[PDB]
Amino acid sequence: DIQMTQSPVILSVSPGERVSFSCRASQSIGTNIHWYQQRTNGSPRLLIKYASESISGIPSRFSGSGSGTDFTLSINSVESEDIADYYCQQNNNWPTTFGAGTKLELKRTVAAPSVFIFPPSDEQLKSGTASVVCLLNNFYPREAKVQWKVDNALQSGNSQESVTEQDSKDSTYSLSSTLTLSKADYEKHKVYACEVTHQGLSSPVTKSFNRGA
Amino acid sequence: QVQLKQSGPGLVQPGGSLSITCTVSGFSLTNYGVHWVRQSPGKGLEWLGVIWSGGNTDYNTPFTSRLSINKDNSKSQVFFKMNSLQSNDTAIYYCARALTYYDYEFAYWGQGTLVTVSAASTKGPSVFPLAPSSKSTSGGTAALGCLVKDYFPEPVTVSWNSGALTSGVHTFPAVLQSSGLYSLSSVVTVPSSSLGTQTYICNVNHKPSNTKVDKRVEPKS
Numbered sequence: 001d002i003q004m005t006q007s008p009v010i011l012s013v014s015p016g017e018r019v020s021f022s023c024r025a026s027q028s029i030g031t032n033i034h035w036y037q038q039r040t041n042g043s044p045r046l047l048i049k050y051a052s053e054s055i056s057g058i059p060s061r062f063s064g065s066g067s068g069t070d071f072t073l074s075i076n077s078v079e080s081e082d083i084a085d086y087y088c089q090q091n092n093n094w095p096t097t098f099g100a101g102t103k104l105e106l107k108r109t110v111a112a113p114s115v116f117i118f119p120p121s122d123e124q125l126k127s128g129t130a131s132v133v134c135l136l137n138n139f140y141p142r143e144a145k146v147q148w149k150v151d152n153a154l155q156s157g158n159s160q161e162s163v164t165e166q167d168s169k170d171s172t173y174s175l176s177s178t179l180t181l182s183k184a185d186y187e188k189h190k191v192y193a194c195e196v197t198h199q200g201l202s203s204p205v206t207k208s209f210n211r212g213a
Numbered sequence: 214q215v216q217l218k219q220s221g222p223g224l225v226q227p228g229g230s231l232s233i234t235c236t237v238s239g240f241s242l243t244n245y246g247v248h249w250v251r252q253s254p255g256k257g258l259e260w261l262g263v264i265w266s267g268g269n270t271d272y273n274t275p276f277t278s279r280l281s282i283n284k285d286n287s288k289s290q291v292f293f294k295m296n297s298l299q300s301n302d303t304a305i306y307y308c309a310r311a312l313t314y315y316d317y318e319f320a321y322w323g324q325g326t327l328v329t330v331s332a333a334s335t336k337g338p339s340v341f342p343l344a345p346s347s348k349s350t351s352g353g354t355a356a357l358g359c360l361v362k363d364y365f366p367e368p369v370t371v372s373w374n375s376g377a378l379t380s381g382v383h384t385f386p387a388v389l390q391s392s393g394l395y396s397l398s399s400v401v402t403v404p405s406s407s408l409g410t411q412t413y414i415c416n417v418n419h420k421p422s423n424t425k426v427d428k429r430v431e432p433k434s
Contacts, residue, residue: 034318043307043322044258055320087258091317095273098258114402116356118343124360131360133343135400137383162385162397176385176398178360207349 023088112200134194235308329366337422358400
């Protein structure tokens with residue numbers, strides 16, 4: 001079977017620039033390559049067929065080139081709606097096979113997160129567990145750090161976090177971190193605090209609340 | 214227009230079987246093949262097989278002994294069945310149609326069906342509010358949300374106000390807790406001036422447990 005190799009794994013590009021994706025085949029496939037876009041939580045979308053042939057409804061800024069083993073997908077003037085993963089497919093040789101994808105990241109200006117902290121709900125506390133949630137909203141770049149402090153003691157081993165994919169409308173990320181305690185442990189301490197560092201913050205930002213206040 | 218619509222997600226035990234239905238519109242199954250492709254973080258996109266116009270099938274080599282595709286032409290349905298499932302078969306499964314009856318240029322795709330292969334049992338979520346705060350309302354904008362806790366398998370879908378609220382919504386990727394159950398949060402930022410009059414309800418659907426939970430998210434007194 002033919003291996004389709006896409007490199008690099010992620011392409012970070014500024015708005016309005018021309019971007020090129022590489023796909024290489026382990027043996028010659030002629031021009032029998034198709035390209036797809038896949039937006040977050042979406043299905044693949046056919047962009048280009050047979051190396052360079054256009055598809056109805058696809059913007060003219062998409063094009064493809066190459067023959068043999070060395071292929072390129074190009075976007076002229078990249079824009080926010082192009083934030084997505086991009087896949088190649090060969091079908092010169094059965095079975096048809098796909099590359100592993102390149103992710104397109106759009107650069108933007110540095111944006112510090114807006115930070116929010118949420119105490120556990122009274123309904124959750126009924127059931128014996130307390131989840132405290134910290135939200136870091138609409139930041140760039142993706143690197144961010146959250147530290148949990150309970151009565152000003154750094155917490156370790158009791159939190160989990162999740163980061164969104166890049167937002168196609170404003171090119172930012174968001175992050176949620178959850179600190180999970182027993183209700184009994186939660187009721188033994190007073191100050192709950194989320195401390196955030198980010199490139200856009202010259203000093204850490206802390207959001208906190210006092211339980212019961 | 215051409216559309217392919219798939220059955221919902223679900224959990225299968227190792228060694229069991231999965232069944233997915235693809236219902237097509239805008240073309241006849243008597244004139245086009247329908248292909249099946251799956252996607253996982255560990256194996257990427259993988260073509261599985263096809264049922265052609267006249268009923269012939271091809272199955273990709275790894276799957277020839279445990280895959281069955283058949284169809285109901287008169288009802289525009291294609292049925293994908295796979296047996297002897299193991300963990301590495303957990304994936305999003307897609308049906309797809311090509312531009313031309315004989316080709317593999319996949320112009321039309323179903324929405325995908327997440328099949329999870331695990332010995333665990335299904336559990337529907339608990340949903341708790343993340344209330345907007347007063348000491349946390351930054352420059353005319355407030356943040357609120359819902360915590361969707363302790364469910365299995367993926368996925369859950371979350372909407373706000375039954376789909377009428379979409380701007381500013383962030384539904385986070387689920388995290389697997391050490392308990393073996395998933396949790397996620399969904400948040401939205403809204404005008405602070407709206408918090409007294411506008412209602413905000415998060416709608417959480419977990420098809421594998423056939424549960425739908427709606428939670429109103431209110432400022433506290």
